[PDB]
Design an enzyme around this catalytic site. Sequence first.
Site, PDB file in Angstrom:
ATOM      1  N   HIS A 173       0.808  -1.223   0.000  1.00 17.01           N
ATOM      2  CA  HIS A 173       0.000   0.000   0.000  1.00 17.01           C
ATOM      3  C   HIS A 173       0.842   1.275   0.000  1.00 17.01           C
ATOM      4  CE1 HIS A 173      -3.179  -2.730   2.007  1.00 17.01           C
ATOM      5  NE2 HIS A 173      -3.545  -2.542   0.750  1.00 17.01           N
ATOM      6  N   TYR A 228      -2.174  -4.992 -11.159  1.00 22.17           N
ATOM      7  CA  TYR A 228      -1.660  -3.998 -10.226  1.00 22.17           C
ATOM      8  C   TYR A 228      -0.598  -3.093 -10.840  1.00 22.17           C
ATOM      9  CZ  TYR A 228      -4.549  -5.654  -6.417  1.00 22.17           C
ATOM     10  OH  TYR A 228      -5.624  -5.962  -5.613  1.00 22.17           O
ATOM     11  N   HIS A 377       2.040  -9.093  -5.042  1.00 18.43           N
ATOM     12  CA  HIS A 377       1.214  -9.658  -6.118  1.00 18.43           C
ATOM     13  C   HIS A 377       1.965 -10.513  -7.152  1.00 18.43           C
ATOM     14  CE1 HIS A 377      -2.036  -7.332  -4.436  1.00 18.43           C
ATOM     15  NE2 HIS A 377      -1.340  -6.221  -4.588  1.00 18.43           N
TER      16      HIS A 377
END
Lengths: 743, 743
Positions: A173, A228, A377
């Site tokens: 994040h 992403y 990811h």
Amino acid sequence: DVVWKDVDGVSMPIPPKTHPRLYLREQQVPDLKNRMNDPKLKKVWADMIKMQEDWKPADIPEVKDFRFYFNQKGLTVRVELMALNYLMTKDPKVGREAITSIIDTLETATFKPAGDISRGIGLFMVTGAIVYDWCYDQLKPEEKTRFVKAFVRLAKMLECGYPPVKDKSIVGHASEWMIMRDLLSVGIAIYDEFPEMYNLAAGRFFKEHLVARNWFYPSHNYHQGMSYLNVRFTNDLFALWILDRMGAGNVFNPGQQFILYDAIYKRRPDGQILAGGDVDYSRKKPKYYTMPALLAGSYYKDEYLNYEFLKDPNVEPHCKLFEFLWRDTQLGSRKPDDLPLSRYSGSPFGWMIARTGWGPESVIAEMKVNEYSFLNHQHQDAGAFQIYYKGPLAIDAGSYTGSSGGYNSPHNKNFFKRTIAHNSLLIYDPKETFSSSGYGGSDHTDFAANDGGQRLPGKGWIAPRDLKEMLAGDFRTGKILAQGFGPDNQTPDYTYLKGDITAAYSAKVKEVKRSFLFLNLKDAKVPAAMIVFDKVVASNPDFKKFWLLHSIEQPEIKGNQITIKRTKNGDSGMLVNTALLPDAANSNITSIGGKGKDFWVFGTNYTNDPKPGTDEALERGEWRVEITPKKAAAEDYYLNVIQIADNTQQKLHEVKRIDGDKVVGVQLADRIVTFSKTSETVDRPFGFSVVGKGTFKFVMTDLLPGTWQVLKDGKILYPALSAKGDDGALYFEGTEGTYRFLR
Amino acid sequence: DVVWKDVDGVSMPIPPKTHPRLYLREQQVPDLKNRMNDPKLKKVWADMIKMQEDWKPADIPEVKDFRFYFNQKGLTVRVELMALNYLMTKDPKVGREAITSIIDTLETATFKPAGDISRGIGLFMVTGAIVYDWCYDQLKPEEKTRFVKAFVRLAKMLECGYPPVKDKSIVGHASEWMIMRDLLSVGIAIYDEFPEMYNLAAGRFFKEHLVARNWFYPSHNYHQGMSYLNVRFTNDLFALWILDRMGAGNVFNPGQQFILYDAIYKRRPDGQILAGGDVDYSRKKPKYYTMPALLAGSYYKDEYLNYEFLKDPNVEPHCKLFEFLWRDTQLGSRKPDDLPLSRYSGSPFGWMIARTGWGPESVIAEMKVNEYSFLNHQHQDAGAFQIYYKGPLAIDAGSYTGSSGGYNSPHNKNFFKRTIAHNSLLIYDPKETFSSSGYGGSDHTDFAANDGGQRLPGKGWIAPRDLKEMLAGDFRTGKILAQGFGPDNQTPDYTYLKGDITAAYSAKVKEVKRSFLFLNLKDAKVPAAMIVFDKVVASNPDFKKFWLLHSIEQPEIKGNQITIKRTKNGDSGMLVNTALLPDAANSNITSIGGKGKDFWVFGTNYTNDPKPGTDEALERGEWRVEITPKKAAAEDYYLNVIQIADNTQQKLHEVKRIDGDKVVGVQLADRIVTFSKTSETVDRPFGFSVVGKGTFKFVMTDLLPGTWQVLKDGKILYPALSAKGDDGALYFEGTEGTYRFLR
Ligand SMILES: O=C(O)C1=C[C@H](O)[C@@H](OS(=O)(=O)O)[C@H](O[C@H]2[C@H](O)[C@@H](NS(=O)(=O)O)[C@@H](O)O[C@@H]2COS(=O)(=O)O)O1
Ligand SMILES: O=C(O)C1=C[C@H](O)[C@@H](OS(=O)(=O)O)[C@H](O[C@H]2[C@H](O)[C@@H](NS(=O)(=O)O)[C@@H](O)O[C@@H]2COS(=O)(=O)O)O1
Ligand SMILES: [Zn+2]
Ligand SMILES: [Zn+2]
């Protein structure tokens, strides 16, 4: 024009003593009027006018989502456009209204915990930063102190925290909006009154974020998968534009320009993108990288990327201002059609993308080493290959979301992110422990399913803080040994990659090598082939080896012949594998899948059905093929030859294995390919015989770089040929006969 | 069929318990009758009959050096032919005559100290071994004892001593006949009675000689210059043949086959060979590599080498038997005409040879890094270039022998073997010492002249014993940074080599790099060019820098231009250098030469006039040019463009310097070549402008390997080209415009 001062060993730019310095400087302000009268940018401004209107009471969701905030409406849009107006007109009462409108709501705003709620907070901080910097000369001493306090109150609410000491700098994040747009903007806006914020936010960016990105940028790729890539790279590009518009120039390695070229290569005829990392699937609407294409295209003035932007030239409402301020509407646009058909991503990637064209009849093949693992990811997919032609044929299987759950799901943790989900290799040690103690932010499990695949790196499957921690850790998963593509740059006959992925696995293996050789066959009927040569040496002969090949639909296994077809969703491609090694007397070929077995891992199936109306093609996969040796042996080799044609094709090419002196190879069509029998450097004379009609194209790999001599039928064919360092290979044309090679 | 038992970690073959085993086994004995009747080998057989006659008493030199023995006549020939007759006929009394004719002389022979007398001693030993092995079943037990005794006695006289613990294993007299032909042969013969000699001799060969040779062999070259290539490589090949014929197979790296290709590339149209290392010169008779061409050609069945042998199929008398035994007379022969025009020799050499053809009109150019120095007959010539065209133009100066003396001469020590004798780079440190105490076998001398050149490695300028010692010591002189040629393998437009030769010098420098770019201009008026770009960083700015260019005849200096012509001996080539960097305001160009100044080394001329009737073209040189900065500075750059043409050619190509962004280059004819302005890796965007009509061929060097993008006039020209690892270069064609490059 900005001053660079060393901070803790790392050079940093000090914000200039002027306003505005956020997103633009005063020299850009007169051009804002010209942008206002630009018809292409009139529509985006007209969109912002419509965004001023509040949310309708019957449309406000009960869960105030990150999507709710990104679909920006109402007050904050009104104060930004008012701030834009002051910027352009300098009428004091406008600067006053913007300040007065926001100051109260800014210092008292509350956010109820929801999905990625830092993004709603950060965006609300950015609205404040816009007002503070753009309307700076209209601020009062008391108001300057009120804004600053409100910013610190809001800054504490972010997942990275304030001071931003939490989370990761290469992934997570903190590699999104919160530091690289949101905290960076505020820090710049308030630097003269409260220097601390910039110092900590830009401090972490320069010390960690920047250093990590500048390390992998030269290889022109990203590591977080094909979904992403959007949120991660967009935020890299915000830091680019923000620091540049402050006057700090381009802080990034300029290789940043070509990062999104990978996505252009990964684009299939149905408007979708080749799979990789944490992805979902859809066939309704094409996938776009609108914002990254906008930002990179306009900064670097790249027409290929701008073409990618103009596909769907519609940004998220909260990014409308940035399109208004930053878009280059004079830049031209270029279709990807004149680009070379293969592209290589070097260290720390070692990835190859090979194509046969740019039209609807395109074979698109990916081959991967992975020299390092970035986690988050990224999947433990070292050695994976993936092939598309009129439908996904050899697939990167599973889904990110479905009936199992999200990132947290026992399917992500046990199948999707694991080697067993991919076209790679397994070595099953029944005693192997897979520590997953740190994975996710919730539903945390100490151990994950033994898939016989690659390790889970980090402190229990968690990404490192920064590059320093990454390089000193256990995230190394391979080494690129050799690479290159066809004799021609534009339209290569062959595309070659080889890696050693031993370090991806635990000590249960002594050595794991994989060589890929994609062939563009320059033929309408059978356009492309892929040769995979593997060497696996297990530390215990009783650790069962696996070669995997995943598909959507059920494969036909007929002897050493595997056939996979597409016959759904308009897809009509076909893949046929000829298993050459191990020998027919030593190969078992078992298929596993269908309902109850679709995501099978050595005992438990990790189900993950599509959420209603999503993944209508089942690209998550339902089946896989396993090739295993019959005999328990320490050392085994796999040699498989894949051919690609449309399902309408009856007769493909005869695949012949070459068994030569020191070498093993493949003959099909007009192509001959050899590898070292032992997959090691060939530093001595070798040879083999060729039987067949016409001229063949030869690719000899695993060779000692230097001057080689090629003899045929006892006579000199080529007196001197150079095998180069990067590919360690020789290329030439010859006919049938007995070949000898001298070194 | 021989057994290999490990001695001291090194696997060593054991002589088989059978006779004959020297030079052949029993299975080739029947073929001796066929060879006897071969119309080609009957001339050499007749030669040996002629050699049976003693020296006419008038002809005996009474200073009997190695030549007296190598011109083998009389008794030793007789007993060898008697032994050969016993082999073919098995008539016991013939075996008896061979033994009894030699036994007494072998015990009693004395050898007066003379030029390389060990060679005669060794040959006498060989004779003894032939009788012993071929007539072994006719030896009485007491006679074996006597032979063994006589062999040890004679062995003690050899320069390597017995035990063979003296001299060097890579260079020197112990890398000639004494161990690899002579001691090895005797050891093999007497092994069953006295295994010690083979254990020690083959002991030292396998542990030292072989290891050293197998290290450099892959790069297909030799290190002792173009004359001593004969004796040195000949003996390597004797060991090859002797051990193979014993039944041990090929103990050498098979790359041994291609070593002599270097001489082939260096053959000039006048029958001479391009200079290198210790050589003398002649226009009277062509140089031949008859014996190495014979042994390597016949062993490896190589028709290029056999062609080299057949130019002059005339073997020295003492080798006649080996031709009879080993020559392959069925083998074909190929002229060099179909060979590629450039050849690269990798580590530990880093040598490029580049030609424009194989006939009278060919340019021949040599470029050298030198990663290691082997000493003995090798020169301290890191960075040297040499150019031939219709005569030696850019030369390799001095002479091995002349009025100064032989190997031990002041000329050798102070000029010939030194950097100043070569087209390389000097950095004069007035306080530097050059320790030379170990050099040579006589007339030792503590220090050699300060030539401003490269170090004297080893312990007083003397070679190390073996490879182990060499790697541990100070013999490293260079690192190959990049190399390549192309775009075509056969007839490359360009040939490129880059080396960092900092290690060749003392700490008086921090950095010395040299990039060569040879251009085959494919041009009737100017067949070739060579660009040389140098970076030199001195430890003291006051250490005077020199760039050198040697010639036979007096150069003409006109501003930044140097013209060198050949006008004698039927030679007619011409060289024109344009000095581009340092520029006019920082460049002094001076010529030094003529009588009293031909071998000038800072205050002293090391005179070495030709021996009469030799060097009729004066290839030893009389002149040099020195380019030095006008201004004292630590960092300096040389950029020089050499054009090669006929001496009647009035107009040559205009040479222009390219001053770009991050790069500096050259434009001449249709050619553009760029270098990093700092001779370092270019890992950022760069550019430059091109003005001129037509299509140019670009070669950009010093580039970070990976995918680059070329733009001309703000537009994409090439969306993607790959710079490869070995050369770090881009090649492409283009017209005039403003170029930018993105990475
Ligand atoms: O922006 C993301 O990276 C991201 C968006 C979502 O928060 C979440 O995806 S999901 O909604 O489909 O579940 C997911 O966030 C991950 C995050 O990438 C992980 N970061 S990491 O530790 O650096 O790898 C971590 O923080 O966990 C998040 C979700 O896990 S959960 O909250 O426990 O469900 O991707
Ligand atoms: O075969 C040779 O290498 C060689 C033969 C001659 O003996 C001599 O040449 S000369 O007559 O023209 O002078 C020269 O011998 C060298 C020898 O190579 C050196 N070996 S090294 O130390 O390993 O470098 C050394 O032994 O010195 C000799 C010359 O000095 S002398 O023997 O006293 O004459 O080359
Ligand atoms: Zn995956
Ligand atoms: Zn020399």
